[PDB]
From a paper:
Dephosphorylation of both enzymes is exerted by protein phosphatase 1 ([name]), a pleiotropic phosphatase involved in the regulation of cell growth and protein synthesis, other than glycogen metabolism. [name] is directed to its different pathway-specific substrates by scaffold proteins; PPP1R3 are those orienting [name] towards GYSs and PYGs. [name] (317 amino acids), also named [name] ([name]), is ubiquitously expressed. [name] is composed of 317 amino acids with a structured central region, containing a carbohydrate-binding module 21 (CBM21, residues 133–261), flanked by largely disordered regions.
Numbering used by the authors:
A (entry chain B): 83 to 102, 111 to 128, 133 to 259
B (entry chain A): 7 to 19, 29 to 299
The structure:
């Protein structure tokens, strides 16, 4: 297959229209075929991309997801927490089956020399299962235990979602 | 999010800020799920800059067929200078969400924050909605793909070639989301121009990127076994313009460009056999 212009085979090259109500149809989408030739992705922008709303969530809930990347089929990230006591427990609560089950991954303290003495930041890394059926949902949220209380980042009630293939 | 209520409202000529936010998030996830160097299968209609001239985009669809009656590929520059960037980009993202494998959007040099802050889009967002919406649009734009190869024969991008581009794997390695730098491969693909009076590469009068002559185009095509460069970044009077003996073509789909000009708009229709023709909007 190879490019050829309409001039070359006798037809008009150009077709010019001079210028100066809605109608509805129903369509079977299998009768049109894909124009594209041919993994996992995050279904949310990193909360930290918009600092003002990240600050708003972080100061309202005392915990907020800071950064999150999907490295291979492993999800890795950083969580920010308000430094209310000395001992803390930061957990990622994640599901690979639309919340029929979940598991609690423990997060890790990061030295983080700069970042103030008002917040601390924790890391996490979670290996996704090798095979996940396509109809299942992958979602996760964040718990922060400190000072006799529990705090949650649940992304304003939608959870952080990850979508497949 | 109800896509069909939105497309319905847009095609009657007002949208809530959350509908627009929704279009941005959903389209962003789609853009990331598909390659950054799209590999497309003709038949195909390829269009140049729209620059917010929404009624002229609607005319483009009236003439070339509303989606998915025809497949489209857009070479960037959706949102500046004109009077209706918001409507233009919302119809395009709505259609990308509705027919994600038959509607394609490439990134042009005006889908960058450093540019559309200055030439009008930010002002439209600020007046009609608020700044946060423009920040969301910017994160969306950072995920647009950069170039397309139709049927292993036509190479499409918004600006043109780059003196760094030895193989396509460079383009495929570019990570998203990303801003456009002031120099380098991604910059050149959105900013560089052909010039008839240049042997090889030279400086670019806009102060960004470079300029390439016909010999750069022919050597490129032969190295990659390609047939036609298809780009779209500068007004041309007839709507389309040939270069290097029909080895490159410039498309520009916004007629009477912000009233300063008197140019026609054009769009290239390529059928299954890779036979190309042009469809033009000449104003009165
Ligand atoms: O286990 C299946 C469960 O999974 C999904 O929910 C998950 C959710 O998406 C995650 O975010 C996670 O993490 C926590 C949550 O996000 C935090 O916000 C916090 O929740 C606080 C609430 O926000 C706050 O409103 C309050 O909640 C109280 C309610 O007001 C009150 O109604 C009552 O709750 C009882 C309900 O009456 C009743 O519905 C019943 O709950 C069942 C659900 O209806 C059913 O759908 C399913 O839940 C799913 C859910 O749909 C998914 O989205 O099973 C449930 C069985 O319990 O029973 C409730 C009481 O037992 O009382 C609550 C407080 O108890 O306070 C809470 C904090 O106290 O905490 C969440 C973790 O506890 O949560 C789940 C994953 O565990």
């Amino acid at each position: 297959k190879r490019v050829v212009f309409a001039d070359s085979k006798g037809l008009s090259l150009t077709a010019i229209h001079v210028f100066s109500d809605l109608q509805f149809d129903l369509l079977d989408l299998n009768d049109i075929s894909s124009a594209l030739k041919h993994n996992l992705i995050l279904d949310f922008p990193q909360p930290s991309t918009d600092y003002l709303s990240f600050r708003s969530h972080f100061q309202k809930n005392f915990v907020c997801l800071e950064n999150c990347s999907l490295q291979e089929r492993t999800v890795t990230g950083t969580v920010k927490v308000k430094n209310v006591s000395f001992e803390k427990k930061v957990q990622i609560r994640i599901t690979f089956d639309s919340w029929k089950n979940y598991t609690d991954v423990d997060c890790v303290y990061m030295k983080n020399v700069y970042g103030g003495t008002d917040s601390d930041t924790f890391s996490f890394a979670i290996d996704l299962p090798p095979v996940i059926p396509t109809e299942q949902k992958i979602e996760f949220c964040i718990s922060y235990h400190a000072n006799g209380q529990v705090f949650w980042d649940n992304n304003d009630g939608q959870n952080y979602r990850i979508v497949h293939v | 999010l109800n896509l069909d209520s939105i497309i319905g409202r847009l095609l009657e000529v007002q949208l809530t800020e959350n509908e627009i936010r929704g279009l941005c998030l959903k389209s962003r996830e789609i853009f990331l799920s598909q390659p950054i160097l799209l590999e497309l299968e003709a038949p195909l209609k390829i269009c140049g800059d729209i620059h917010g001239q929404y009624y002229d985009l609607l005319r483009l669809f009236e003439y070339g067929g509303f989606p998915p009656e025809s497949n489209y590929l857009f070479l960037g520059d959706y949102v500046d200078r004109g009077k209706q960037s918001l409507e233009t980009i919302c119809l395009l993202l709505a259609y990308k969400i509705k027919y994600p494998e038959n509607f394609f959007l490439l990134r042009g040099n005006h889908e960058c924050a450093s540019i559309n802050r200055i030439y009008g889009f930010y002002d439209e967002c600020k007046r009609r909605y608020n700044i946060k919406l423009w920040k969301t649009f910017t994160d969306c734009f950072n995920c647009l793909p950069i170039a397309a190869i139709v049927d292993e024969k036509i190479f499409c991008c918004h600006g043109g070639l780059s003196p760094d581009l030895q193989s396509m794997e460079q383009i495929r390695r570019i990570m998203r989301p990303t801003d456009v730098p002031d120099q380098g491969l991604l910059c050149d693909l959105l900013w560089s121009d052909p010039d008839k009076d240049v042997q090889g590469w030279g400086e670019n009068d806009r102060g960004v990127s470079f300029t390439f002559g016909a010999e750069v185009v022919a050597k490129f095509l032969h190295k990659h076994d390609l047939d036609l460069i298809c780009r779209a970044h500068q007004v041309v009077e007839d709507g389309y313009e040939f270069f290097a003996k029909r080895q490159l073509v410039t498309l520009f789909s916004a007629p009477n460009y912000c009233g300063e000009f008197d140019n026609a708009g054009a769009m290239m229709s390529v059928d299954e056999t890779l036979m190309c023709s042009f469809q033009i909007l000449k104003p009165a």
